[PDB]
Short mmCIF file of C-alpha atoms and ligand atoms in Angstrom, two decimals:
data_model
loop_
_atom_site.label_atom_id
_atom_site.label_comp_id
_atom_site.label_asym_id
_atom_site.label_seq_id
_atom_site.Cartn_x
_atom_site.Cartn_y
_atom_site.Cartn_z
CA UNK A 1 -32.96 -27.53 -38.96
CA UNK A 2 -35.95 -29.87 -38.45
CA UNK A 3 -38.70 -31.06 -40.72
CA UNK A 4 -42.72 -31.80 -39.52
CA UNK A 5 -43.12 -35.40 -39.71
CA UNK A 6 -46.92 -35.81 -40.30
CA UNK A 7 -49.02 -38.56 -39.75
CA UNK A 8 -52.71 -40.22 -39.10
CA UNK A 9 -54.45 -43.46 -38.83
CA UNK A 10 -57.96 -44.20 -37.77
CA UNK A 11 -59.64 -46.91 -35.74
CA UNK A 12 -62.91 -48.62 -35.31
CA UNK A 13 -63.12 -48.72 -31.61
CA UNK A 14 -62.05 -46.59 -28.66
CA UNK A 15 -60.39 -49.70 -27.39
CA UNK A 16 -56.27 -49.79 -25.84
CA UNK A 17 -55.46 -52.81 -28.46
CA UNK A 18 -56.87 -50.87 -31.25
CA UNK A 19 -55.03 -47.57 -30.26
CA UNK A 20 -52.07 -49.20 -29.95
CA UNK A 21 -51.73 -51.31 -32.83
CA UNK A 22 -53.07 -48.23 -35.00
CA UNK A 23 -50.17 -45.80 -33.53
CA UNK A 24 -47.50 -48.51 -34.08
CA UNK A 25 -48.14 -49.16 -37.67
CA UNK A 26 -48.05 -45.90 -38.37
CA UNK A 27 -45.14 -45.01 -36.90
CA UNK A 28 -43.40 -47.69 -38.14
CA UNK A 29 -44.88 -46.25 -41.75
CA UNK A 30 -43.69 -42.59 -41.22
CA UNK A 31 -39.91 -43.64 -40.24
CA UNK A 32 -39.69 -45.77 -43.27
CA UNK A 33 -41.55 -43.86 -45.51
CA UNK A 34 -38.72 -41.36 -44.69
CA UNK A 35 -35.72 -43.53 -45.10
CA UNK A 36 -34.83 -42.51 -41.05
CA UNK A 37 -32.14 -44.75 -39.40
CA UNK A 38 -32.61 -44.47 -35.63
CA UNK A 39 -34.94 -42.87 -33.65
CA UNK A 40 -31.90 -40.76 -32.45
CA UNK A 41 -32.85 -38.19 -35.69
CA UNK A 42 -36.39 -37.71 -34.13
CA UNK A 43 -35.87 -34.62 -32.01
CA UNK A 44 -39.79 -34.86 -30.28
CA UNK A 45 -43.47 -36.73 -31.43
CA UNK A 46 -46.58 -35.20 -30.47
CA UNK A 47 -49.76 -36.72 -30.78
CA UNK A 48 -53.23 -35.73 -31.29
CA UNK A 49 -56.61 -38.20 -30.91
CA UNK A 50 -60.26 -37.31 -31.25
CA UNK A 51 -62.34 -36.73 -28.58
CA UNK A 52 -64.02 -40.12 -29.52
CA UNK A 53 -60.88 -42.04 -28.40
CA UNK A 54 -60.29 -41.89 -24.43
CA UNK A 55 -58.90 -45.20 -23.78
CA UNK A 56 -55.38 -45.39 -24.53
CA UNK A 57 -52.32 -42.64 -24.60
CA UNK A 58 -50.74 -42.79 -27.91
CA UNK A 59 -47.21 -42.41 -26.41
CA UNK A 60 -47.64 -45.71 -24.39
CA UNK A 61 -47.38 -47.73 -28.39
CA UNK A 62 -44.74 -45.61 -29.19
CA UNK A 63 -43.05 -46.97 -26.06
CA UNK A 64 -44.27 -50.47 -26.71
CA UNK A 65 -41.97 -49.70 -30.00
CA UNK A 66 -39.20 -48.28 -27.83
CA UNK A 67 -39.63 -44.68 -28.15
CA UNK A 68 -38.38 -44.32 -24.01
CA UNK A 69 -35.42 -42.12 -25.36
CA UNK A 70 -37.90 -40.05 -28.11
CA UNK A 71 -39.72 -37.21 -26.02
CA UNK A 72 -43.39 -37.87 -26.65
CA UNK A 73 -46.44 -36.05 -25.77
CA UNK A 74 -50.11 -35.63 -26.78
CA UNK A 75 -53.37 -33.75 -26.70
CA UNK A 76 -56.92 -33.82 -27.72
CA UNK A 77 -58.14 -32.70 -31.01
CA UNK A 78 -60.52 -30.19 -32.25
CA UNK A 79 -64.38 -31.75 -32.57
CA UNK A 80 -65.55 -29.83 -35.49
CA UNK A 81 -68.82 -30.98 -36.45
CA UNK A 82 -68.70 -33.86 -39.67
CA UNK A 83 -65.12 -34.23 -39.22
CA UNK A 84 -63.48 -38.09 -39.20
CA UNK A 85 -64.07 -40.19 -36.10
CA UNK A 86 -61.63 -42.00 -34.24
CA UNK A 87 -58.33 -40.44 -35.21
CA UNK A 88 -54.86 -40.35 -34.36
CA UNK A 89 -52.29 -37.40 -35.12
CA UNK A 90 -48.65 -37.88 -35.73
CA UNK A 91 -46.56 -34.68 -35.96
CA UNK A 92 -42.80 -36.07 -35.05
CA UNK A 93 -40.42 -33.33 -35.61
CA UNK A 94 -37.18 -34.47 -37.13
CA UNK A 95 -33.99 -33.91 -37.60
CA UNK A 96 -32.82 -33.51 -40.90
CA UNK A 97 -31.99 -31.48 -44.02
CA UNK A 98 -34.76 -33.10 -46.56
CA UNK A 99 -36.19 -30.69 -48.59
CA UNK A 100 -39.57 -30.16 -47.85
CA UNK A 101 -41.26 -31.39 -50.73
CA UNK A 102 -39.23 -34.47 -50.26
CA UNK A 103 -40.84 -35.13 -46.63
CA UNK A 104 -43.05 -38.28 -47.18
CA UNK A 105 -46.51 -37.72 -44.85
CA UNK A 106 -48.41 -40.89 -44.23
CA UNK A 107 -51.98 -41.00 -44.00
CA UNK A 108 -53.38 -44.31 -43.07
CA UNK A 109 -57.14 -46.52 -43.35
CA UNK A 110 -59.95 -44.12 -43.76
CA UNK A 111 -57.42 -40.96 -42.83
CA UNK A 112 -56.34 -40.59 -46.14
CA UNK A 113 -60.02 -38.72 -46.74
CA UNK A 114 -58.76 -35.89 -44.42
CA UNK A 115 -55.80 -35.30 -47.35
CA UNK A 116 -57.37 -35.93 -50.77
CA UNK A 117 -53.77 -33.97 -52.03
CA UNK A 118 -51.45 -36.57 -50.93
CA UNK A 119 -52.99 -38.99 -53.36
CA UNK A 120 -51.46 -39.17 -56.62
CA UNK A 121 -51.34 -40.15 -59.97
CA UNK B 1 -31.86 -24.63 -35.22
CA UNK B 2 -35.50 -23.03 -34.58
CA UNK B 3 -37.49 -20.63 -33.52
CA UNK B 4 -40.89 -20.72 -32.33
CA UNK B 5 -43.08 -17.34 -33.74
CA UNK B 6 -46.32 -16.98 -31.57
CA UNK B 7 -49.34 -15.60 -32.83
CA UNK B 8 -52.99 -15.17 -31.26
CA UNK B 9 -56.46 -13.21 -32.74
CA UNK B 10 -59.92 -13.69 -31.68
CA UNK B 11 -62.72 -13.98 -34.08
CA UNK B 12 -66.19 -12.29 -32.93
CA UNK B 13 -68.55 -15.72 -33.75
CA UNK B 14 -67.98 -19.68 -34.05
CA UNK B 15 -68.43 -20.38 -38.01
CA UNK B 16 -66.09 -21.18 -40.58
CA UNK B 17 -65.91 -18.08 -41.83
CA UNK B 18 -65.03 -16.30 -39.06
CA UNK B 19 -62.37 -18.47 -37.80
CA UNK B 20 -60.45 -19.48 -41.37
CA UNK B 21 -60.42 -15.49 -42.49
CA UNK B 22 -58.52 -14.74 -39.23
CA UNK B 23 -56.50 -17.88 -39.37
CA UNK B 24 -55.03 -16.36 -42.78
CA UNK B 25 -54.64 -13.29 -41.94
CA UNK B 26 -52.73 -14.23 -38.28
CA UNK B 27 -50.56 -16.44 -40.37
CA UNK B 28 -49.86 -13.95 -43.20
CA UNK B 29 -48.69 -11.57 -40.79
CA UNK B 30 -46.90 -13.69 -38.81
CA UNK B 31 -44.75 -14.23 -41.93
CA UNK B 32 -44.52 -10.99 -43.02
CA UNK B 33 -43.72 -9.58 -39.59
CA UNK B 34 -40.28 -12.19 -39.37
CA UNK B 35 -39.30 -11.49 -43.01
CA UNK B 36 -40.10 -15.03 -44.10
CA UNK B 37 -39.35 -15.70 -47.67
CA UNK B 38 -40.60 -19.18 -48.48
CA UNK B 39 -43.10 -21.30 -46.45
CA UNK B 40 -40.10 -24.21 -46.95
CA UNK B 41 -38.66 -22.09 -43.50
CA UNK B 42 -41.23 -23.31 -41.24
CA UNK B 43 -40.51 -26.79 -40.02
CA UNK B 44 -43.99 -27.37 -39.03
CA UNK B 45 -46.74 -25.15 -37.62
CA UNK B 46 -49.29 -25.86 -34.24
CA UNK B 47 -52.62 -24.49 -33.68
CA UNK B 48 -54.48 -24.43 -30.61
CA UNK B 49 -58.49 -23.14 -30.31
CA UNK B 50 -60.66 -22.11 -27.30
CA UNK B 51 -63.46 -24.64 -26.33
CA UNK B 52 -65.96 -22.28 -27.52
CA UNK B 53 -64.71 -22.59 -31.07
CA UNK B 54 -65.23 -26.26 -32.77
CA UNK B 55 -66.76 -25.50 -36.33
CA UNK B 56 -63.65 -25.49 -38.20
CA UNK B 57 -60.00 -26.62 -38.23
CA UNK B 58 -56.87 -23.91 -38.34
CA UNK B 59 -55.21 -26.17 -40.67
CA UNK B 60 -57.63 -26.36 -43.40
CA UNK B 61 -57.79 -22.19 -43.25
CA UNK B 62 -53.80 -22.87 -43.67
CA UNK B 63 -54.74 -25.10 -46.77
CA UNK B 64 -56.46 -22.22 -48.22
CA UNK B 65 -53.17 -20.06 -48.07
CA UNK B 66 -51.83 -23.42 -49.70
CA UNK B 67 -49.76 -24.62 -46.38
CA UNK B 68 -50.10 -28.45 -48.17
CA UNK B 69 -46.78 -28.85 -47.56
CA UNK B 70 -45.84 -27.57 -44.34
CA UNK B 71 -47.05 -30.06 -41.67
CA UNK B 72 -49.60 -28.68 -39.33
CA UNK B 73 -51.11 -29.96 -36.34
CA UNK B 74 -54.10 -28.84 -33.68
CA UNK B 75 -55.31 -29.15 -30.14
CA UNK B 76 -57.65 -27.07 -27.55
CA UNK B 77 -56.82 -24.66 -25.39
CA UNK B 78 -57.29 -24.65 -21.30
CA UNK B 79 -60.66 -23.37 -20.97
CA UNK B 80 -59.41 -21.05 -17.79
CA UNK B 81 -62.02 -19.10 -16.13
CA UNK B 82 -61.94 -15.02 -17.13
CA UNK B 83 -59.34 -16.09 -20.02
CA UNK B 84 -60.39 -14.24 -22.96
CA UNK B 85 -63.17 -16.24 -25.32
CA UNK B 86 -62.90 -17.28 -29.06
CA UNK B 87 -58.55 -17.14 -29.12
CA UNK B 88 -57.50 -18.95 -32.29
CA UNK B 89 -53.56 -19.35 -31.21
CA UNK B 90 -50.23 -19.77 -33.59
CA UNK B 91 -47.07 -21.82 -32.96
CA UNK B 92 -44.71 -21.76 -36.05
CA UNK B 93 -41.31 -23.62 -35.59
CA UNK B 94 -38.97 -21.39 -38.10
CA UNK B 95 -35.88 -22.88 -39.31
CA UNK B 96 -33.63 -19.75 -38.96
CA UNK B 97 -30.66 -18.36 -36.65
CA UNK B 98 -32.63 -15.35 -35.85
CA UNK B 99 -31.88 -14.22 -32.33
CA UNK B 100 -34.56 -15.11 -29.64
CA UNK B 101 -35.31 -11.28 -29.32
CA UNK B 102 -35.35 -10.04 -33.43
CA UNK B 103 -38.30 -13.11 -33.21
CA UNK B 104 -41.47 -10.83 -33.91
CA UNK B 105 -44.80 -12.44 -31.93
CA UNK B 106 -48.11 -10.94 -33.46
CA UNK B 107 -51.06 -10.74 -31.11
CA UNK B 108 -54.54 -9.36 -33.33
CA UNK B 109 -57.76 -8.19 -32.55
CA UNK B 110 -58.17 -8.43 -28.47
CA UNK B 111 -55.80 -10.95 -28.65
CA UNK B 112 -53.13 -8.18 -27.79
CA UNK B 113 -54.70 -8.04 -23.93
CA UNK B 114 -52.91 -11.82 -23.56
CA UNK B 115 -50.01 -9.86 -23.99
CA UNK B 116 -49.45 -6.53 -22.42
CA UNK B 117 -45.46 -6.55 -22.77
CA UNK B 118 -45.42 -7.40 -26.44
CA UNK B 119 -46.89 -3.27 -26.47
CA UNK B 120 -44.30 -0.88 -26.81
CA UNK B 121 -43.56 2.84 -26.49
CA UNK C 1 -31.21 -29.82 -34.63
CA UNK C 2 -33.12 -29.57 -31.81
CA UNK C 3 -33.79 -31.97 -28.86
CA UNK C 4 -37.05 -32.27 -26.92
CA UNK C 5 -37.10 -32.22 -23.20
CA UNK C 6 -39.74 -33.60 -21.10
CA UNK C 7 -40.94 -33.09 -17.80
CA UNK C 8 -44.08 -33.77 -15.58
CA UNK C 9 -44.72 -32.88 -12.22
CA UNK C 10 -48.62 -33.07 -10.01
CA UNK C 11 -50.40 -31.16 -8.26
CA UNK C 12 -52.75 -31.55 -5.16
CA UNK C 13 -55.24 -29.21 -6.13
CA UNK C 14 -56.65 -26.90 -8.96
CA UNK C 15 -56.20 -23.70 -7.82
CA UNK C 16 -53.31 -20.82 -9.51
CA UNK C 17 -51.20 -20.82 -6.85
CA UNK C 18 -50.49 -24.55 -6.83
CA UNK C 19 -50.18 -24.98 -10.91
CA UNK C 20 -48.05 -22.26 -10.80
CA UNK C 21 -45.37 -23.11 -8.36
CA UNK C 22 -45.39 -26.32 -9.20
CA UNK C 23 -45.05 -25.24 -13.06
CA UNK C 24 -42.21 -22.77 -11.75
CA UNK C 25 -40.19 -25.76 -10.06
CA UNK C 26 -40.83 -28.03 -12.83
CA UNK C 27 -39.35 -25.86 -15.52
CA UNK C 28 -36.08 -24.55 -13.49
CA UNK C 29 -35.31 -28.27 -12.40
CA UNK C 30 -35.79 -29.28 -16.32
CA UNK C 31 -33.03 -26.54 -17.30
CA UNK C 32 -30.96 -27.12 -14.19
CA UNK C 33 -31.16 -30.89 -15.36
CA UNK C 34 -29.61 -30.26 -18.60
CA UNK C 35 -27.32 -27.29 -18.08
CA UNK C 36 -28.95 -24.98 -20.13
CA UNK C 37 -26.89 -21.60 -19.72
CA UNK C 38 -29.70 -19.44 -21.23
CA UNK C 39 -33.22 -19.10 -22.27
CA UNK C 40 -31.93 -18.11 -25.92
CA UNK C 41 -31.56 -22.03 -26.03
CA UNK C 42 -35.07 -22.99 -25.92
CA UNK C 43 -36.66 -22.56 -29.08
CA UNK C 44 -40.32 -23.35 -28.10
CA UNK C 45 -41.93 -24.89 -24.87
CA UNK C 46 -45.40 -26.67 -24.97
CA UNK C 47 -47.39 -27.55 -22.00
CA UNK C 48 -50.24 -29.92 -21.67
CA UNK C 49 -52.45 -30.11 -18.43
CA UNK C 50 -55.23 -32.91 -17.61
CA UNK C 51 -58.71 -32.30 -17.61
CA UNK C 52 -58.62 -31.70 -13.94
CA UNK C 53 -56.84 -28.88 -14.10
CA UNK C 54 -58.61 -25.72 -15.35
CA UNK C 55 -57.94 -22.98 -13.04
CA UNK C 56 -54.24 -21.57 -14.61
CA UNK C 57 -52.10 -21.40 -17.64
CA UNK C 58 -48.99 -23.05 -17.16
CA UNK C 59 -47.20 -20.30 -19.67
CA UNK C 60 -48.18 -17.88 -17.19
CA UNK C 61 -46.25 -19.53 -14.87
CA UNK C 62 -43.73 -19.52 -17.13
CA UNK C 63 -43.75 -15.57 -17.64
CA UNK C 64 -43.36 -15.05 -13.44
CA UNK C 65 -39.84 -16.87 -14.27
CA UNK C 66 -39.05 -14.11 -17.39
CA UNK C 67 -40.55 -16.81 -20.17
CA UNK C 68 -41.80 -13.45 -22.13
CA UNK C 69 -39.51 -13.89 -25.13
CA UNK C 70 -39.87 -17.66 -25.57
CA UNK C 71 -42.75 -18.93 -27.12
CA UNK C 72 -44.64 -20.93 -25.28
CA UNK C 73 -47.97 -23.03 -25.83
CA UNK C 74 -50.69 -24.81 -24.08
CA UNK C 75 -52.93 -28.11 -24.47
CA UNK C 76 -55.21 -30.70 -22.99
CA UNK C 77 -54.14 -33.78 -22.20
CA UNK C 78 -56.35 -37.13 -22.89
CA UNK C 79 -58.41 -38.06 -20.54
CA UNK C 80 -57.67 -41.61 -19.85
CA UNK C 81 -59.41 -44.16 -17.53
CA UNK C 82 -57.07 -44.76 -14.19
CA UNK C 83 -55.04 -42.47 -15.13
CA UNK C 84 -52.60 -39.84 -13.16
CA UNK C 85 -54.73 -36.84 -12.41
CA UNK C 86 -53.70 -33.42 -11.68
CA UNK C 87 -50.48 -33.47 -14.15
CA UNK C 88 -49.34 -30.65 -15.97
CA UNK C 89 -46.42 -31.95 -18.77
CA UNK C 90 -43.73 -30.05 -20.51
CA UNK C 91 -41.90 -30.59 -24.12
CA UNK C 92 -38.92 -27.91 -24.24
CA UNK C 93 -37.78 -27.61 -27.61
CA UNK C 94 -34.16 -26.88 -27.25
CA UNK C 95 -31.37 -25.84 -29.85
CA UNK C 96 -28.50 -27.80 -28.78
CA UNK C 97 -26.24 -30.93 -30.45
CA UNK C 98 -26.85 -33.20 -27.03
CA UNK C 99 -27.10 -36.66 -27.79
CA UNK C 100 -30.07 -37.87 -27.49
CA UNK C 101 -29.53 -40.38 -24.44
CA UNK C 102 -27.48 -37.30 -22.66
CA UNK C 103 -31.12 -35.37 -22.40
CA UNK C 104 -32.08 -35.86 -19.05
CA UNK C 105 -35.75 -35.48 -18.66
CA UNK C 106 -37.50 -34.52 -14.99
CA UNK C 107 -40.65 -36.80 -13.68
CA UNK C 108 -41.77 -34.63 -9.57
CA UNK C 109 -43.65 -35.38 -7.02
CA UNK C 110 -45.91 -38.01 -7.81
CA UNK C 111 -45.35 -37.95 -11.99
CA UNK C 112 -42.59 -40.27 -11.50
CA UNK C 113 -45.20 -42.80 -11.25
CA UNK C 114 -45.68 -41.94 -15.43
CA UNK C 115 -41.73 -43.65 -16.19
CA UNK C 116 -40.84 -46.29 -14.21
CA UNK C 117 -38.00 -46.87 -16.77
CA UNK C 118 -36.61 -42.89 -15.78
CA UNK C 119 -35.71 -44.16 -12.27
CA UNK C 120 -32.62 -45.80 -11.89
CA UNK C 121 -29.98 -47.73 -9.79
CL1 CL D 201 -45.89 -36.43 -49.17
CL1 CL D 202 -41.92 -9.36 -30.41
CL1 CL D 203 -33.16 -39.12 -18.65
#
């Protein structure tokens, strides 16, 4: 049994360094938010980035973070009309039996707009 | 272990509307046709949309059927020449040791021409 | 628990007849790979193609090798500057306890050029 993983960050320029550092930090964010040991519980990540954001493959910062052994892959977005610029999508499916209301999501910079819910109290 | 459920439908215009009623009712049946209980079964669901569909997002139809807590993720469709317009399409990952072929895959609207097998005698 | 599988393989051209049998080859080679006994194993496969490639669905491809009962999706890839073109990418979702550095994913034809770290001594 697996659990959705998910994630977003946003950036201010459709730029490699930018891309990069964004998808690192969160990442880095969702394992620990999650309390995961080693990337050996992550069964697959799959990405998702705006149309805005052509520059940079996500998967190349998770393997700038050693993700070689995670399988990785990504695709582009839907551009709905008003919808947040400059975005990157985490979904990393993992390995685990966490309840699902005890799966921490992690919504990063100006993506925390796209989940007003995840804020609390 | 998992499952993926497939579903498809095809809406008849590009508004919100049109695309978030069908997204509910797809997913509702989806459910209903594999004898789901809880939405704490699905490990995560993916959405793809045809290119000729960008004025809403699957997920936040989802929302609306109060999927908050399932993790959901989207992307575009190959915009394949003849391939039927305005396909909102359905990937749920279902925790459950349901055989591959008791799996039910619900196809709506003219989304059942994608998939002449799934019609039975 | 569930471990992804990745493959990519290229194509010369955008026509059906090269997507598919190069989708055909990369899928059998990816199962061969890991000695998967039967498609019951696979709980989900997702394809992505580039932006180059519009004339085929890889899951049809998938359906001329018997694919019909396991679920299969399809995305674009981002388009990225300098990048490989003419790629179409796999993530198999499979239902097995493998460790995670005993999945051996499957980089044809000129895709190899994607993971220099896959090739070895
Ligand atoms: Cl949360
Ligand atoms: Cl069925
Ligand atoms: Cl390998």
């Amino acid at each position: 049994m697996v659990r959705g993983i998910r994630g977003a960050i946003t950036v201010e320029e459709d730029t490699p360094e930018a891309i990069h550092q964004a998808t690192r930090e969160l990442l880095l964010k969702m394992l620990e938010a999650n309390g995961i040991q080693s990337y050996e519980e992550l069964a697959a990540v799959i990405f998702t980035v705006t149309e805005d954001l052509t520059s940079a493959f996500p998967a190349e910062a998770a393997r700038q973070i050693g993700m070689h052994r995670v399988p990785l892959l990504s695709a582009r977005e839907v551009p709905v009309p008003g919808s947040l610029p400059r975005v990157i999508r985490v979904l990393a499916l993992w390995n685990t039996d966490t309840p699902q209301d005890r799966v921490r999501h992690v919504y990063l910079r100006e993506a925390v707009r796209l989940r007003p819910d995840l804020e609390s109290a």
